[PDB]
Amino acid sequence: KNIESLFDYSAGQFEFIDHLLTMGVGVHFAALIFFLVVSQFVAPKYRIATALSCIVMVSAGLILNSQAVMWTDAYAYVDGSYQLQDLTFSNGYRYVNWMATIPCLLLQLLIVLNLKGKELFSTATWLILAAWGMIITGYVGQLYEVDDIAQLMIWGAVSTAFFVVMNWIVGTKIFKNRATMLGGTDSTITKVFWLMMFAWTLYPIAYLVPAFMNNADGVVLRQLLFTIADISSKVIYGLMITYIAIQQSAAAGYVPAQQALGRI
């Protein structure tokens, strides 16, 4: 039901997707190690944000490594190409974790914005349903990525609508709460928001890849877009949310944050 299943692969195409995914694993688990070690410099009121990037990290990676292994399971080298065998490879599983990981990353953004209590809980609920809305219509969407390109695109459209709207909540909260942020980070947070615009927009582009390059090289460009967008949405975004928590913690008098910064 997916375009991955339609083609045999050259050894070059096949090895590259394997390395892409394996390199993702590497990055997401090496990153996991970092937020873990620097969590001790983050003040108690921001420490969940870093914590939540650990979880993002172990969620991508788990999925990624599983995709890696389903890739070599599904295909074998037959008559000079890599050909599909008894098992299948799908990206089905990548949408499912975005059900899981997006809240996390929206939540860690909200936490560094200094949202508290009912505005935290309420913002958090709308966004989580908003992004849930986006993922699930696109998830259904890609189900017809071979059979019925009409649905992918209408399902796409329904899902972008969800994207636009979630994007709007987010940025309202970012520029609404900009002034609350300590230690320079009101400038930083606006770079965060644009980074999100960039990375998030790469996934729907992977989404459309079938309608505009339905062939084995589009399969490869899809996984390329995913790695870029995952690295950008998950890890680097993580990196940047952490910088913001450390700096606010030290601006707010958390001495191990003042010592970690001053130590560099």
Ligand X SMILES: CCCCCCCC/C=C\CCCCCCCC(=O)O
Q: Which residues bind ligand X (CB under 6 A)?
A: 12-13, 16, 22-23, 25-27, 30-31, 33-34, 36-37, 40, 151, 154-155, 158, 188, 220, 227-228, 231, 236, 239-240, 243
What residues from 224 to 243 belong to the interface with ligand RET (CB under 6 A)?
Answer: 233-234
Nearer to ligand RET, 227 or 248 (CB): 227
Taking the complex as a whole, how short is the minimal distance between the CB of residue 186 and ligand RET, in angstroms?
Answer: 23
Q: Which residue has the tokens 């410099």?
A: 41
Which of 41, 89, 98, 226 forms a contact with ligand RET (CB under 6 A)?
A: 98
Closest separation in Å from C-beta 197 to Cl ion? 18
Give the three-class secondary structure for 148.
coil
Residue choice 134, 143, 240, 241 for contact with ligand RET (CB under 6 A): 134
**Distance (Å, whole) CA 219 – CA 77:** 18
User: In residues, how long is the chain?
Assistant: 264
159 binds, among ligand RET, ligand X, Cl ion, none (CB under 5 to 8 A by kind): ligand RET
- How many Cβ atoms are within 10 Å of 11's Cβ, its own excluded? 11
Instruction: Point out which span in 17-25, 36-44, 130-138, 185-193 binds ligand RET (CB under 6 A).
Output: 130-138
Neighbours of 260 (CB within 10 A): 17
8 Å CB contact between 128 and 110:
no
Our finding on whether 101 is near ligand RET (CB under 6 A) is: yes
How far is the C-alpha of 62 from the C-alpha of 96, rounded, in Å?
12
* Sign (positive or negative) of CA dihedral 168, 169, 171, 175: positive
Minimum separation from the CB atom of position 50 to ligand X (A): 12
Q: Which residues contact 241 (CB under 8 A, 6 or more apart)?
A: 49, 50, 53, 105, 108, 109, 112, 192
- Annotate 75-127 with DSSP letters as a single string: EEEETTEEEE-SS---SHHHHHHHHHHHHHHHHHHHHHTT--HHHHHHHHHHH
CB of 66: closest distance to ligand X in angstroms?
A: 15
User: 27 is in the binding site of which of ligand RET, Cl ion, ligand X, none (Cβ under 5 to 8 A by kind)?
Assistant: ligand X
Tell me which of 204, 210, 218, 238 binds ligand RET, using CB under 6 A. 204
**For residues 27-66, which are near ligand RET according to CB under 6 A?**
none
Site residues for ligand RET per CB under 6 A: 98, 101-102, 134-135, 138, 141, 156, 159-160, 163, 200, 203-204, 207, 233-234
